[PDB]
Amino acid sequence: STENGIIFGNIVYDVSGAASDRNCVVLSDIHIDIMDYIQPATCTDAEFRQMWAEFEWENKVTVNTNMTDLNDYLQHILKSTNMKCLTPEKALSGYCGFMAANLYARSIFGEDALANVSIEKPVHQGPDAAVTGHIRIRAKSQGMALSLGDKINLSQKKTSL
Amino acid sequence: MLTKFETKSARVKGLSFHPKRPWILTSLHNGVIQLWDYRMCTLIDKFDEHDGPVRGIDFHKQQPLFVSGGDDYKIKVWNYKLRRCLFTLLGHLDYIRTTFFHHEYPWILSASDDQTIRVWNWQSRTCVCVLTGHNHYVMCAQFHPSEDLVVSASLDQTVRVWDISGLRKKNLSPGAVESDVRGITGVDLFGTTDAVVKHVLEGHDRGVNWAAFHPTMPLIVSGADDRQVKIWRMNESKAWEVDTCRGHYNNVSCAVFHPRQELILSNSEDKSIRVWDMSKR
Numbered sequence A: 001s002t003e004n005g006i007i008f009g010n011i012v013y014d015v016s017g018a019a020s021d022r023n024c025v026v027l028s029d030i031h032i033d034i035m036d037y038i039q040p041a042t043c044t045d046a047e048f049r050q051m052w053a054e055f056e057w058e059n060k061v062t063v064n065t066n067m068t069d070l071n072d073y074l075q076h077i078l079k080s081t082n083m084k085c086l087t088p089e090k091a092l093s094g095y096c097g098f099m100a101a102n103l104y105a106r107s108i109f110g111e112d113a114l115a116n117v118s119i120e121k122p123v124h125q126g127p128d129a130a131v132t133g134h135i136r137i138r139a140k141s142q143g144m145a146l147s148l149g150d151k152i153n154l155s156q157k158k159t160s161l
Numbered sequence B: 001m002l003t004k005f006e007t008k009s010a011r012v013k014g015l016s017f018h019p020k021r022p023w024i025l026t027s028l029h030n031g032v033i034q035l036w037d038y039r040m041c042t043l044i045d046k047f048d049e050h051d052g053p054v055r056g057i058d059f060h061k062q063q064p065l066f067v068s069g070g071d072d073y074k075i076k077v078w079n080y081k082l083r084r085c086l087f088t089l090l091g092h093l094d095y096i097r098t099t100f101f102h103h104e105y106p107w108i109l110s111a112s113d114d115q116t117i118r119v120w121n122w123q124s125r126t127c128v129c130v131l132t133g134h135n136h137y138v139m140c141a142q143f144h145p146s147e148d149l150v151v152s153a154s155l156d157q158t159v160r161v162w163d164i165s166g167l168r169k170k171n172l173s174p175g176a177v178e179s180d181v182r183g184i185t186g187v188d189l190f191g192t193t194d195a196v197v198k199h200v201l202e203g204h205d206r207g208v209n210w211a212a213f214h215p216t217m218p219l220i221v222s223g224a225d226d227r228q229v230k231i232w233r234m235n236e237s238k239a240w241e242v243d244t245c246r247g248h249y250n251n252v253s254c255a256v257f258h259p260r261q262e263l264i265l266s267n268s269e270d271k272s273i274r275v276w277d278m279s280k281r
Helices: A045-054 A073-083 A142-156
Strands: A012-013 A026-028 A059-063 A100-106 A112-118 A133-138 B014-017 B024-027 B033-037 B042-048 B056-058 B066-069 B076-080 B097-100 B108-111 B116-119 B130-131 B139-141 B151-152 B158-162 B199-202 B210-213 B217-223 B256-257 B263-267 B275-277
Touching: A045 A100, A045 A112, A059 A142, A059 B066, A073 A142, A133 A142, A133 B056, B014 B056, B024 B056, B033 B066, B056 B139, B097 B139, B151 B210, B210 B256
Parallel strands: B139 B210
Antiparallel strands: A012 A026, A059 A133, A100 A112, A112 A133, B014 B024, B024 B033, B033 B042, B056 B066, B066 B076, B097 B108, B108 B116, B116 B130, B139 B151, B151 B158, B158 B199, B210 B217, B217 B256, B256 B263, B263 B275
16 A cells, blocks of 8 residues: 555655764665566457457567577566466467467556567577567556566566666 | 756745755745755755745755745744754844854854844853844855854845954954955955944945855955946955956856855856856956
8 A cells, every 4th residue: 555656666765864873875766666566367369359459559669689489488577577478379389489479467456468479489590589579568657568568678588687 | 967957947046055965955036945955856845935035045054954034034944854943033124144053052143134133042041142234135145264254245235244252243453464355456345234344345236146255265256236246356356356247148146156166157147157267267
């Protein structure tokens, strides 16, 4: 509880200089992010598609670039955000695949977020060590939504924070 | 390098920057007093001190507190931090421009925009000082070099410099040679705001918007109710010191010294801030 709508937290906080102390720390937080919050959540595909289109379209971020195949990479990202890819078609996340992966999640304060990311995928002189897949992010406010696309973008790779 | 935050609003007569904090406390004549402890781009509080206008802002001198003045005519000191009112007296027939805090017996000075300013004992109850020598409507009231020596700027077209006492105003002296306040080539006029020859300096320049002091010094840097903002040094007292500070188009509401910077910053009304030296000027 306690709604405060100061998004991403990052709200000023006080420790005060009020006694053996002349100053102290006033701080705003940072360090308060999304990837964690949302839990995986699920859907019927036809309805899904319909829905996918239907949803708050308004955010997307791109996937392109990493350190891994989207097998290990995808798993890693998935676990990191604690979120769902709804369903496979065996077409094949292996030989290429030339697979677009649909992901859904529902959070602790209940937003459902929808993705279709469509991605190249690693494999010798076939394709995938980048993507150039587009991550399409729908979350109700664009501001969190895009931000989520980012957040995930942060999540995507593994490097010096 | 960066102008971190910027929205044009507020119609601002009185102003102060936190010598300790990156606060700006701002007085509008919207009737508003505001403290924003400017750092986190956030206002702590905002009280429109009364229905009438607000001209004054001054420091208590401590760390984070305001002493405030409105057309209420009241000296309030309220601590933002402690969100409470320290000791209270209202004001005469005009608002409070400057304040200083002292403490033999935790003791107090209040500087005012009207008539008198009175300095009060709430401990071993006696009189430290009485200041008469103001009339109405003080634009910029000031502590001097000696902090508890002072200057005031008026819409009564005078300037007052006063001498105080621990039992009201007086000074004892007998050694000097000539004076720069008044004693050789050039010098600017007395005004009338009080009635003792300390120096009441002429605040006529259609009236004086601001007065600013030179710490050990008596040079003043001024805002004036003339295009002419006229600069005088009473640590010299030049001729072509009958300087009118000139825009292109009208005014020079103020022009000011920056403690550190040996410079003058001018600001005016053709849509402008005008840039001035004062190191070689």
